[PDB]
Amino acid sequence: ENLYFQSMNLSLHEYMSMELLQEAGVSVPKGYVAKSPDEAYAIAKKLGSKDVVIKAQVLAGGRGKGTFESGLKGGVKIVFSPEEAKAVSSQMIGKKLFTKQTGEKGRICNQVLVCERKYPRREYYFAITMERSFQGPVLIGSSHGGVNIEDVAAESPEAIIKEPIDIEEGIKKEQALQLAQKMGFPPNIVESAAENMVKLYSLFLKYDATMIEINPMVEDSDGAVLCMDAKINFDSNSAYRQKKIFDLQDWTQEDERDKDAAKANLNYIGLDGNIGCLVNGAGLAMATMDIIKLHGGTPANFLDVGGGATVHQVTEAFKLITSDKKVLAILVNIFGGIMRCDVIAQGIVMAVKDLEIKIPVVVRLQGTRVDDAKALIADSGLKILACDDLDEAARMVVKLSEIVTLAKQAHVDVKFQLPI
Amino acid sequence: ENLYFQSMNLSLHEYMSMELLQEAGVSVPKGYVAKSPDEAYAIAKKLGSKDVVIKAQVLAGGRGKGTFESGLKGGVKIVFSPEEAKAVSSQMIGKKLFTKQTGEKGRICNQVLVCERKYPRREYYFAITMERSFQGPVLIGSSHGGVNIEDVAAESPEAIIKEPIDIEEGIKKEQALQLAQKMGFPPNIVESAAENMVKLYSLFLKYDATMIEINPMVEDSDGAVLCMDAKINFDSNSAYRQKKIFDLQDWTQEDERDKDAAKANLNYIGLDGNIGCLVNGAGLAMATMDIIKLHGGTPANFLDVGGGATVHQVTEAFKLITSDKKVLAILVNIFGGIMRCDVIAQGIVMAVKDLEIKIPVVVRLQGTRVDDAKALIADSGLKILACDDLDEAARMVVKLSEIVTLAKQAHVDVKFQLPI
Amino acid sequence: ENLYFQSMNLSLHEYMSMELLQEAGVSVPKGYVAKSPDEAYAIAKKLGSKDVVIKAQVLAGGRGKGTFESGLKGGVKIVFSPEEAKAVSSQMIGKKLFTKQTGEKGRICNQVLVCERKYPRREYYFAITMERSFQGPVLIGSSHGGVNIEDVAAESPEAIIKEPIDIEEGIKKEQALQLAQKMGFPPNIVESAAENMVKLYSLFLKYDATMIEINPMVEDSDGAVLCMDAKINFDSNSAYRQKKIFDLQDWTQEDERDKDAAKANLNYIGLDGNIGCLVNGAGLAMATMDIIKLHGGTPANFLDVGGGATVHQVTEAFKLITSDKKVLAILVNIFGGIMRCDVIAQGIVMAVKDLEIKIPVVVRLQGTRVDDAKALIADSGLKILACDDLDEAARMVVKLSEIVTLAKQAHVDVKFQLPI
Amino acid sequence: ENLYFQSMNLSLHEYMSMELLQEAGVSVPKGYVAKSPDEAYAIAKKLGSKDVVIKAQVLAGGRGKGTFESGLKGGVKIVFSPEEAKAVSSQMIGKKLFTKQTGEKGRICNQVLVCERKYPRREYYFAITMERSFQGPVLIGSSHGGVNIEDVAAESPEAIIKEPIDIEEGIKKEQALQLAQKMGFPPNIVESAAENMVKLYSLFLKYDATMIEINPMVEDSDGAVLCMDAKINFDSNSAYRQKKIFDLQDWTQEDERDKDAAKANLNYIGLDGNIGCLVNGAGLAMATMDIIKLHGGTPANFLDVGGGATVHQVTEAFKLITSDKKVLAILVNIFGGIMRCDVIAQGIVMAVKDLEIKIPVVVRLQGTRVDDAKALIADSGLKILACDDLDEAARMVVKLSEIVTLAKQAHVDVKFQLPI
């Protein structure tokens, strides 16, 4: 489901997206960022010392059901005095949040968002998303905000209004009024909704975004609709020309291995197995995972070197797989194409020679240079276990993983070589 | 049950024991040996060309229930003309007998026994056996011959008469009359029974026998009791001074590996496992089997080098284990004592160097010379996988057997070495 | 768990309790009752034609998760115009609500409650309950309203403030201020909370109530704390002197059998079995249920005739068990005491004679009159199957139920009589 | 397998058939009958006081594997003095033989057969049997006597010689010589075999026999072939004209119920169930058994009244089923035909009225008189539970058996009647 394997789209913390909406002129509750209880106190007394909401800036699927190490329920709190605001913030900042998505490797709440608490009258869901069905941006709107939207979308498909937009002519205000009036806005604040949607679409086109979800867009108790949440999924490919947004990327929310892989343009996918891999292209990565799971194995943490990567890239790759200790047997399964196989053969030679890779490297190299790669493998004269059949390679690597974990139990050492 | 592991007592073919009884003067039906149908014809016409019995000379537990490759039931047949005697003998000589004891590796019927057929009137079981309970020879007699004797012995212990004998004063004829009259002999042929028992005891003491079982000793239709079967279990230790009996040992009834082992004074025990061994003493052999079966393994074919054997003996031993292909991992588990451990270390060095023993040799050497053995193992500088704990050695060897059979499946080669 | 078997405490519809709070002077949102969409329209336009809440008046454990036959989710709705108020009310009034407590025999929503929608700022739970631990009324208060209170009470027992009250000296305002300030009220509206609690306690003592639960007591966005829900569990025994409250009892929420049983002072307990009963006292009723479930049976619908009931009461009882068709075998298990057993014997005689009770009546009568009861049973001369051992009676009745359901399958008729 | 249900062919004791062979002139070992140890002594001393065989006269499938109450193995013994002959006979006469066919209801050994013991030289099987395949008597001969013949017949069909005979021209001596020479008789005693077969065929035709099995026909140690066993299965239908043979029928070998049934020309079949029956014709008897076993029941002991039986016959029948106590529910399942159904209706009326048949009689009467039978059933006015569908009748009777055994457990009494 979803993509997962292909790219990890940049998700910002809540306060960054809230600031981005603020600078764009979108109507928004007053909000600030707190790194310590002191400025939390300062902002709480600045907003009136009463009726304040505190939100945790943690990137996870579960944020209201998570648990802190201090023993607090959820990531959102409602405080009514700056003193209790400091008290609760002292239990969030510097604390590790345990949610079901993390399980046990929870992310740490570095900052918090301090906002004014506003009472919503009606709850609308809204979302500007790029999509292939309508060959472009789509404005989705509904009057079922504040609640999970997939359930009502599946049970009541009519209630989810979807309107496409023509990109070359841009967005027209009449379209925004049409969407607002089809959702069911009050006839006195439709203009504000149209202005908010126009500003949101301008932000959507400017920052190279992919999906701006406002859930829920809520009318206040005194009109002047205000957005509550501003989830933004950006585009990974837009790193080259969107420097401001991508520089603010939070790196604490991912493993240091992920950061190192991204430093060299290598996709990384960790897992719960004990058979490392090194695969060219996501498709053959899922293929390798499926074929390993067929033979009773389970991949541990496998990579994706992209196309045209240098030898240093695959050297860093092998460093990255060998960094994890849960790995037992590594297979480099790269078929040829854009990624010139000879540089991978050179990279395996260099990486096995340097980092002392004693684990069984079940290589399987093909494509656009087979003579050079195999010739280099033979010239290097190592335990580089050559193979040339995908099913045979998977069988061999799974059996080698079992052999390694068995010999570790037996407290004996083994060395693997091709049959004569 | 029984001994099995310790020594394989010499069991002769039926015709040899029948001849031995004949030369001792024991009353016996006329019998001859046939190697081909031609002399079977000659003997059948010699005995009257009618009322003849043919017996198969195969050493197995099942002889009347076995099957030939030609498709004949049982090893005994009753022929009434020399022509049908030739016909049935052509289906016995040169044919392979399939019994449940053999299962599929049946022994070949080399010769047959041609005897006159006599109608028994009463069936007595009789047996002169050495035993520890009565500290010497024991004459066992009963009137339940021709039928398996353990069942009636267990159900009716009174019916099995047992009489001990004092060796220095020999056997007395009065004792033989007492035994005959307690079995229930007719009062007219008791003297013949006493003479037969005296002759049998003389044969028992002469040929260094251990158990002479006559089952069934039968009175004929005209008196003059005649023995039908003459099973004789001899003594293995009596080879030095009983040359005539032990030279007539049939070697076709055992595997060629057994013959080779006996040629060098090595006990051999084949099995259905895939972990070879090499054990000093039967007791530690059962210990090794039990400890291997504890860890899920199963020994394949393990030996017993006795005491004080030369280095050539253990070289031949390792040749013998490596001869079998069903073996995967070999453990030499010799503790010290009479068998000087240093000669075994020298033997493993020489045998691994010569026969190219690539299988994992999980050695475990101790006793009366540990410094010399370990020093020689270290000086030789091989894959001689040293170990010094019995449970650890069994764990290691079972895991190595699993590793070997797994790598054979994976079609990859491995080399085993001690952890650094 | 709970009581269930002993008494069904009178639970009023929401609007009746809301009116009771209104007449007592308790601060309360404006609310009205609608029986048809027309007055729903009238009240909606009366309250401002906007920001209105509609609640279903159904007595069930699940009210926000239930389903209507029309296909609407939950019993609460938020409407913003009188027209959509009429539209939603047309899908509530006259409709049958399906909740998990009912399963399939859902209660019908006869009326609805139309109220003004107010935005709560803080949510407090509060409850005046009679209890034995504190030998009287207890004021329970907490700052975790709007959410199920058992979870937070068990996980955080400190957060649930409990304060007892001395009945003879009444409640003191200082106690109300103490409770308000220990919950954490704002220091400007503590007086209003104290006045509300005093009025609620006066209502609690007046109407012979047992538990008044305000969940959640919420401060408004402009002070002047207003109660949202006003659950009231009354006292069954207080029917004699509380006529106004008990006359307003809604009878549609229970089976007509329950209404008929209450018309004659008989406790009724329906079930999912097929062995009817008729038991004196709740304790022996649970005893009979347990002993029937021991023998593999399951009681169908069993009663409780109380003490000193007339013969007409037990005649109506037997009419009531025989009314249900799911019953197969009926056991009257009354032990003596206050309930004079002879009148039950007369009642069984009359009821079996009149209503033609052909089902096996496994009677078991004892206590304070055994001679008269058994004499009357014998004089009447029927199939009144006498028994005098509790375990034997349960065995007999379970076996008779099996016999009856088996003979119904066989399409044959049976008649049961005591062994001669 | 076999017939079982249809007729119990008269099997005589061994000594009667041996005498029958003796009077016919068939060569036979000398034999006598002993009822007490005294004449056993007399005969043993008459035959030479030595070499005597004792056989038990018990009609069962297992005779050499059975057990006596005294604790003796098998029914055959070999004695060599009249004193031990008396001793063993004292453990046979008056003793109850336990074989697997009987299980626990073993037959009692009333007499024994004392015979001379002869040593067989060759063992031939022989049998004159009526059969439909060859439309008459068949002489079967083989040279595999003394051993079970079905195994060798199935494995080696060629070895079983079968020769048919033309009845009108009788048997010809040339045919007997042909059979003897095809079995493999010695060429000097073929004439004796032919004479024996001619005499056996004369006996076969005279006594209206069906199968005369000589197993094994054995040549003696001095020629003059002598028959050992002389099993004779006679014809049930030949009772009218074979008075001498059928008068000697032993009745102790069957249950007294079987004797009573045979006294009135009723077939009886006891079983291990608890649903009695009363069926016209064997075919519908197997049909009723199969249909009862389909519905989870098991018939107890069911009958066969033949054709044209009087009312007294079915009265005795019902007496016979009701005699057994293991029966619970009785079904009379007679379809019309030769057996006039009205007499069965009269018989059920009389038998239920007389013997006080309180068990549920699930009648199912049809055929050639339905008006009279049903009219009589209705006029008698009883609990005669009428039914008219075979599957419905089986369902009803199985359910009634379950109801009866359930009410017996409940210690309550029931009465069954047709639904109104």
UniProtKB/Swiss-Prot annotation, chains A, B, C, D:
Entry's localization field: Mitochondrion
Modified residues (Phosphothreonine): T298
Binding site for ATP: K55, G62, R63, G64
Pathways involved: Carbohydrate metabolism; tricarboxylic acid cycle; succinate from succinyl-CoA (ligase route): step 1/1
UniProt modified residues of type N6-acetyllysine: K35, K45, K86, K96, K100, K173, K325
Assigned EC number: 6.2.1.5
Binding site for Mg(2+): N215, D229
GO molecular function terms attached to this record: ATP binding; magnesium ion binding; succinate-CoA ligase (ADP-forming) activity
Catalysed reaction equations from the record: succinate + ATP + CoA = succinyl-CoA + ADP + phosphate
Keyword tags: Acetylation, ATP-binding, Disease variant, Ligase, Magnesium, Metal-binding, Mitochondrion, Nucleotide-binding, Phosphoprotein, Primary mitochondrial disease, Transit peptide, Tricarboxylic acid cycle
Gene3D superfamilies: ATP-grasp fold, A domain, ATP-grasp fold, B domain, Succinyl-CoA synthetase domains
Residues where N6-succinyllysine is found: K45
Control of this protein's activity: Inhibited by itaconate.
GO cellular component: extracellular exosome; mitochondrial matrix; mitochondrion; succinate-CoA ligase complex; succinate-CoA ligase complex (ADP-forming)
PROSITE patterns registered for this protein in UniProt: ATP_GRASP, SUCCINYL_COA_LIG_3
Known tissue expression: Widely expressed. Not expressed in liver and lung.
Modified residues (Phosphoserine): S236
Cofactor detail note: Binds 1 Mg(2+) ion per subunit.
Domain of life of the organism encoding this protein: Eukaryota
Chain positions of site Important for substrate specificity: D51, Y119
Pfam annotation, one family: Ligase_CoA
Subunit structure: Heterodimer of an alpha and a beta subunit. The beta subunit determines specificity for ATP. Interacts with ALAS2.
Purpose: ATP-specific succinyl-CoA synthetase functions in the citric acid cycle (TCA), coupling the hydrolysis of succinyl-CoA to the synthesis of ATP and thus represents the only step of substrate-level phosphorylation in the TCA. The beta subunit provides nucleotide specificity of the enzyme and binds the substrate succinate, while the binding sites for coenzyme A and phosphate are found in the alpha subunit.
Family to which the UniProt record says this protein belongs: Belongs to the succinate/malate CoA ligase beta subunit family. ATP-specific subunit beta subfamily.
Disease tied to this entry: Mitochondrial DNA depletion syndrome 5: A disorder due to mitochondrial dysfunction. It is characterized by infantile onset of hypotonia, neurologic deterioration, a hyperkinetic-dystonic movement disorder, external ophthalmoplegia, deafness, variable renal tubular dysfunction, and mild methylmalonic aciduria in some patients.
Name of this protein: Succinate--CoA ligase [ADP-forming] subunit beta, mitochondrial
